[PDB]
Amino acid sequence: RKNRKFLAQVLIKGASHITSASISEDGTLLAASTPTDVKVFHLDPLYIKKVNMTGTGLGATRVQISPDKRWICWAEEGSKVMISRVHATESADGISYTVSVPHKLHRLRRQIPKHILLGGLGSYDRNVSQIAFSADSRMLSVADLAGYIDTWVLRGP
Amino acid sequence: MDIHRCRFVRYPASAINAVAFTHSALPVVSSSKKYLQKNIQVRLAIGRANGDIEIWNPLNGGWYQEVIIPGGKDRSVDGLVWVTDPDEEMADGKIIHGKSRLFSIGYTTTITEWDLEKARAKKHASGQHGEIWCFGVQPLPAAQNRKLVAGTVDGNLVLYSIEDGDLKFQKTLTRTPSKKTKFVSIAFQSHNIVIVGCSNSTICAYDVRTGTMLRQMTLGTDLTGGSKNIIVWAVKCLPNGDIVSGDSTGQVCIWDGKTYTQAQRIQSHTQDVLCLSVSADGSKIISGG
Amino acid sequence: SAAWPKAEDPALVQELLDCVQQASHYRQLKKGANETTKSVNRGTSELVILAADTQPLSIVLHIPLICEEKNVPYVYVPSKVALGRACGVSRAVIAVSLTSNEASDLNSKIRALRDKVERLA
Amino acid sequence: LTALRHRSALREALQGRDELSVINILRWAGKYVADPRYRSICVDVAFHLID
Amino acid sequence: LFILTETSAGYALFKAIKYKEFAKFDSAAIAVEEASGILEGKVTPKLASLLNELKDEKKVTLAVHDTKLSNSITKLPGINIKPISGSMTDDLFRAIRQHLYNLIPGMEPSNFDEMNLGLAHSLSRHKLKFSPE
Amino acid sequence: IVEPHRHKGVFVARGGKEDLLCTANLVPGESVYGEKRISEYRIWNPFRSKLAAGILGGLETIYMKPGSKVLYLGAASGTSVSHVADIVGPTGAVYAVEFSHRSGRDLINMATRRTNVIPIVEDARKPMAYRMLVPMVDVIFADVAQPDQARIVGINARLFLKQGGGLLISIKASCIDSTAPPEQVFASEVQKLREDKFFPKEQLTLEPYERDHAMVSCVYLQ
Amino acid sequence: IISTFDIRPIIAELQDIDVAVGGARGAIYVYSNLLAHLHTLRVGTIQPRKYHWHRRAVHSVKWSGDGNYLISGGYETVLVLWQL
Amino acid sequence: LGYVRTMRNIAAKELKELEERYVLAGPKKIVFFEGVEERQQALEKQKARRKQLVLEKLARKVKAARKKLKALADAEYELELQQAKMAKTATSGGFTKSGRRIKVRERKR
Amino acid sequence: TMERFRVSPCGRYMALVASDKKGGGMLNIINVGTMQWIAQARIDGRHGVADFAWWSDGNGLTIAGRDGQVTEWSMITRRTVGIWRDEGSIGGTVMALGGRNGPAELGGDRWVAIGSNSGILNVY
Amino acid sequence: KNPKDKRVGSTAYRVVSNGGDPRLAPKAKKQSLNLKQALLRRDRVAKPRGGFFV
């Protein structure tokens, strides 16, 4: 009975609903996506603060945080995958997080015929269902409902 | 591998209020014509009481849940309707299938159109009337001019227009004389005849073009308990013209199609029949109470 | 046609003719097109019921203009013979107009009935 | 309660209760074990409530 | 980007922000025939004299906001350029009439609203004889 | 004694026991519908006018001055549109729209004299039928007894109202929803305009003059 | 497990039969039309109408006269009449 | 009956004119805003005997005219009931002096 | 109740109006020789069945309900042949049906007479 | 929610309020949701809810 512990309950402001979330591997970074905003919280073993996001404001459906806690990748409006670097600056009180302006990465133009793109539900099966980083975050991949898998690599300085 | 079983996560279940397929039925083709219906996107939309509208894929028996679009707090979903155009043909004989648009009501005066590409609500339309309780899309006989008919609390059958990516309150066909008549279910017999159930023990049969009234079918008291007014919770229409209606007594009534009188009363349930379904060839009726 | 606030539902038609018969026994009723026009012009009329089975339909079409000017509700029943022997006349009555007073169960019925006519409109 | 012992259903009658009504049937059993004219039925009801 | 504007007098075209060309007219009883011709979407001499160029279609575009007029002038084979309907073109056909004071020194340096009044009276009395008295 | 009111183009006449509203007659020596006139000023009757019931109620602005452009939606037989034409003067012009044929008859027989109005007998739910006839306006007045009144105002304002324009709309609760509270009906209509990209500045009831009628004065995109 | 059955003839020829099989689990299965289902290798899908009221086995099932009603009786000491 | 009808028409016209003049003498308005900030800004902007005598006079005139019209309408209804009581055949309508309501269910042949 | 009934002219059947008004009246039809239910004819009205009459050949029956709806209901096909309306009847009270050499598929009776609650009796 | 109106005694100054529902869904009317339930449970009573508990 003492093993588990109902530790935290984070309430989101507004009226929207949490579409997705993600947490860093050490649990100090949490990110939750509504279809209006993408909110990011910093945690200290609790004590929770809200990291100020900028540049977003149209919501997302999937959110992933890198295993080295440097990349925050979401799926704005379902189909537009975006990513942002977060800069971690240590101080005398502890660590603090500044999230950069979201740098949208472009997805590959697949060859789909015009009658298929007009009929059916339209461009419905473009929205990415999974967002998966590698274990060392040198490589991103996303995947949608049509069966398309699009991957990205990291080119450093 | 060591396992901690955990049942203390009280995930909330939410009541399903509206189930709506994309196509009600596809035309039967052979095995040599199997390649014609391969790109037809058949999806199932299920709207829960917490406002979650979530698309399923039947997948030839796979049933994969694809997208969940949640609504906000204090927001529910009551009715779901897909609007599927007929098959357009190109210049070369290729087939453009029907673009399917999803419409919903949320116990409000507003019909919402959902954008499944952007995974949010696309449009809102509302007129000066009561809260919409039931609605449906007019069936095909016109081609590009299809219209939604919506019943409501205070009575007035409002009629919305949908063409060329639009959803606007066109007009109001009629309203009942009694203000206490609440429209609870709606189903179309043909292109121009709308069958509505009401709360004051009636099944009215309006005619959409002139907005007139063909006949007022009626049902008696409920003699099982109190509350004399029977409530026709679900009407639907057979392909040969008859009308099947489940009501507050748990009955299922079969109404004649040409005369609009009842032909049969089938006492089936104990509590009230809440939803009906009719097979595409008109051979089986499913009733859920 | 020109009879656009038509009462087609037989339950509402039966309610209208039952209230007409009750007002006829209360002597709160004006029968005929000329007497209906006089009651609507004088403003004593609470509700006015025309009939759509009139063979020249244009002989009762002036009453919708005066009811639009005086804001009283008018409604069309199907059968003028039914309206006639609902009033208790033994003739065909094409327009009838039932009036109001201070305090009556009939006046409460009139208020509910014109609410149902406003639901038709 | 004698009819519910004769028709085999006293366990079914007692098994679906909640806290306040268990307290009510216990209060009846305590109040009416005293009369030896229905001590048997009252003790049987108390057996099933203990079990 | 040929746009098709119809005022009570004449037409204007703003293809290249700024206005490109026009067509003016005044004070005739064939103005009500022009009015009925755009009540339906029939053949119109001012329309044809506007859309008659000699080269070819050079880009298939003509922005007209009413779909009825668009797919009634689609069928004319005199120039075989195909128009486009109102794809929620509120901004174009609202801004040109609100900023139409810039246009007035161009084609008709005047105030032409008296024939607008005359056409209004003519159409309204035509419908009052359509409901004859 | 006649003074001009706070609203330009509107006059009041004051006496020892009365205070009346009036306008400056564009056709002197002529009356329209049997109205008293003072020497030439026509007395505006708030019991037959929706707009004159707003001005005596505390309407802060009416958005129109002499020389403006007003589109009148629902011109019932030329009662208030004559006073609106006399407000806007000769350099202004009022575009009357009325679907009903008898009021169209009386509207055109009124509109023959006053040349600054143009009458259009067309359904107000179809703006592309008089898109040729109506230029850009400054003010939309709207007194139409249809349940999609905000939708009619919406399509006519997307096709004819200027950027930053004016809207004076008269809402009828017993026309839109006769069972709900009129405060709730009026709040839903204000919210429909607000999502229809107006900016509601004020709302006032017409209730020494009419029963369950509101007047919403709002601006368009500013 | 079949406890009883009653067959009624649908007619001076014999057009069809309607079989009511009262089973030992309590149900009464009404097979509506049999000679027109087994007259025609291949047969169409036949599916009895189930009428379940008796708890124990149903002792006797009979059609009644005109064929509107299905009268029945089991261990529960009750003559039941299915309106049908 | 004809005299009472003419006097009722005159008195109804007087009541309509007097009620129009009384309304012309003397949750109503709803203003919408996008947000709580704009609502509070408009609330900051909101923070920044002869009529009584003449309106009481018109109110007393309106009440007396309503009394006169109600009296003439009751007189016209009583005279229509007198016609029903004195018809050449048995006609329904009106109460007897015992209180029992007259209702004959015969048809006028 | 069993108060209102009609025995067929052939003597084989007997119809009893079931006391269940509720906006439409039914009548249960009983074989005379065995006194057992064999059919049921339901018409829609406001207060039920005013009266009814067997046809002269003995098969069907004509059921005149209140509020004017009259219904010919056959015994062979055991469903409604047709529905018509009495002229201007605000409510029917009685009906009778007689004569010979009528229509062969409507029982062979020539005249139908329907009397309403106002006092007017129509003969068709 | 919305700020409540302030009346001077004659006029009422009120903030407009439509900031509740941006793009999410409109909030369900609790008076209408309880009415449809009251048509479903007319005179009928609930069965006793749980097990052995106060």
Q: Is J38 left (phi over 0), alpha (psi -120 to 50) or beta?
A: alpha
- J-chain residues near B72 (CB < 8 A): 21, 24-25, 27
**Looking at chain F from residue 166 to 195, which residues have their Cβ under 8 Å from any Cβ of chain J?**
190-191, 194-195
Q: How many CB atoms lie within 10 A of CB A62?
A: 21
Interchain CB contact of I40 with H (< 8 Å): no
The DSSP secondary structure of E61-124, one letter per residue, reads --B-S-HHHHHHHSS-TTT----B--SS-HHHHHHHHHSTTTTTTTS--S--HHHHHHHHHHHH
DSSP states of B132-174 as a string? Answer: EEEEEEPPP---S-EEEEEEESSS--EEEEE-SS--EEEEE--
The answer to whether A22 contacts chain B (CB < 8 Å) is no
Give the residue among C58, C53, C50 at the shortest CA–CA distance from C79: C53
Instruction: Specify the 3-state DSSP secondary structure of C94.
Output: coil
**J47 near D CB under 8 A:** no
User: Least CB-CB distance to I23: which of B218, B259, B263?
Assistant: B218
The DSSP call for residue A136 is: T
Measured CA distances, F214 to F10, F57, F91, J2 (Å):
21, 11, 30, 22
Residue H77: its chain C contacts at CB < 8 A? Answer: 27-28, 101
Helix, strand or coil, per DSSP, at residue I44: coil
Q: Which residue of B has its CA nearest to I47?
A: B220
Closest by CA position to E65, among listed E45, E92, E41, E44 = E92
Question: By the 8 A CB rule, do F140 and F219 touch?
Answer: no
**Among residues B162, F200, B104, B169, which one has the least CA distance to residue J26?**
B104
Sheet with A47-51, side-by-side order of all strands = A20-23, A29-33, A38-44, A47-51
Q: Which two tokens stand for residue J4?
A: 């409540």
Read off the tokens for E14. Answer: 């703003």
Q: Is the dihedral of CA B176, B181, B182, B184 positive or negative?
A: negative
Provide the β-strand partners of residue C6. Answer: C76
> Which residue, among H38, B51, F215, H45, has the nearest Cα to J2 in the 3D structure?
H38
Burial, F140: exposed, middle or buried (Cβ in 10 Å; 0-12, 13-18, 19+)? buried
Q: Which chains touch B (3 or more CB pairs under 8 A)?
A: A, C, F, I, J
DSSP secondary structure string, C2-65? ---SB---HHHHHHHHHHHHHHHHHT-EEESHHHHHHHHHHT-EEEEEEES--SSGGGSTTHHH
Strand-pairing partners, residue F34, are: none
Question: Do residues F174 and J1 lie in contact, with contact meaning Cβ atoms separated by under 8 Å?
Answer: no
Cβ contacts of D40 within 8 Å, gap of 6 or more? none
Beta bridge partner(s), residue A71:
A85
- Best of I28, I32, I38, I40 to substitute, by most chain G Cβ atoms within 10 angstroms, is I38
Q: How many CB pairs under 8 A join G and I?
A: 7
Q: Do B105 and B132 form a contact (C-beta atoms < 8 A)?
A: yes
DSSP-assigned states of every residue in I79-124: SEEEEEE-TT-SSEEEEEEE-SS--GGGTT--EEEEEESSS-EEE-
Q: Specify whether the backbone of I36 is left (phi greater than 0), alpha (psi in -120 to 50) or beta.
A: beta
Residue I72 backbone phi and psi in degrees, to 5: -90, 125
Task: Determine the distance in angstroms separating the CA of I89 from the nearest CA of chain H, rounded to an integer.
Answer: 14
- Do H and A touch (≥3 CB pairs < 8 Å)? no
Report how far residue I43's alpha carbon sits from residue B262's, in angstroms, rounded to the nearest whole number. 9
Q: Which of F130, F150, F129 is nearest to F200 (CA)?
A: F150
Helix axes E113-130, E31-40, angle to 10 degrees: 70
Partner B contacted by A155 (CB < 8 A): no
Complete DSSP assignment for A70-108: -EEEEEETTTEEEEEEEEEEE-SS-EEEEE---EE-PPP
Distance of CA D42 to the CA centre of its chain: 6
d(CA B144, CA B164): 8
Structural tokens at position B102: 């999803």
Chain B contact for A57 (CB, 8 A cutoff): no
Contact I87, C53 (CB under 8 A): no
Provide the token pair at F62: 């009416």
Q: Do chains I and F touch (3 or more CB pairs under 8 A)?
A: no
Q: Is residue A144 within 8 Å of A125, Cβ to Cβ?
A: yes
Structure tokens at F185: 């009906």
At E130, which helix (H) or strand (E)?
Answer: helix E113-130
List of residues 6+ apart from F184 with CB closer than 8 A: none
Instruction: Establish, for the pair of chains F and J, how many residue pairs have beta carbons separated by less than 8 Å.
Output: 7
Whether the CB-CB separation of B237 and B255 falls below 8 Å is answered with no
Q: Entry resolution in angstroms?
A: 7.1
Interface with chain C: mutation pick from H80, H81, H89, H102, highest number of C CBs within 10 Å: H80
Say how far apart CA A73 and CA A80 lie, in whole Å.
Answer: 11
Q: Which residue of C4, C8, C15, C17 is the best one to mutate when testing the B interface, meaning the one whose CB has the most B CBs within 10 A?
A: C8
**CA separation for the pair B177, A6 (Å, rounded):** 57
Strands B120-126 and B132-137 turn out to be unpaired
Q: Which strand (E) or helix (H) includes residue B245?
A: strand B243-246
H helices of H1-109, in order, are: 2-25, 36-47, 50-85
- Which residue in chain J has the smallest CA separation from D24? J54
Q: Which two tokens stand for residue B164?
A: 């060329």
**B250 and A CB contact within 8 Å:** no
Using what technique was this structure determined?
cryo-EM
> What is the rounded radius of gyration, in angstroms, for the C-alpha atoms of chain I?
13
Helix (H, G, I), strand (E, B) or coil at I77: coil
Parallel, antiparallel or unpaired: strands C74-77 and C45-51: parallel
CA dihedral (I60, I61, I62, I63) positive or negative: negative
CA atoms within 13 A on the CB side of F6: 8
Cα–Cα distance list, F9 to A126, B287, F52, F61, F201 (Å): 60, 69, 13, 12, 22
Answer whether F152's CB lies under 8 Å from F64's CB. Answer: no
Asked if residue I92 lies in contact with residue I114, where contact means CB atoms within 8 angstroms, the answer is yes
B229 touches chain I (CB under 8 A): no
The answer to whether the beta carbons of residues B244 and B236 sit under 8 Å apart is yes
Q: Which run of H or E residues covers position A131?
A: strand A128-133
Is residue E13 a contact partner of residue E22, using CB atoms and an 8 Å limit?
A: yes
H40 contact residues in J (CB cutoff 8 A): 3, 15
What phi-psi label fits residue H12: left (phi over 0), alpha (psi between -120 and 50 degrees) or beta? alpha
With beta carbons less than 8 A apart as the criterion, state whether F76 and F53 touch. no
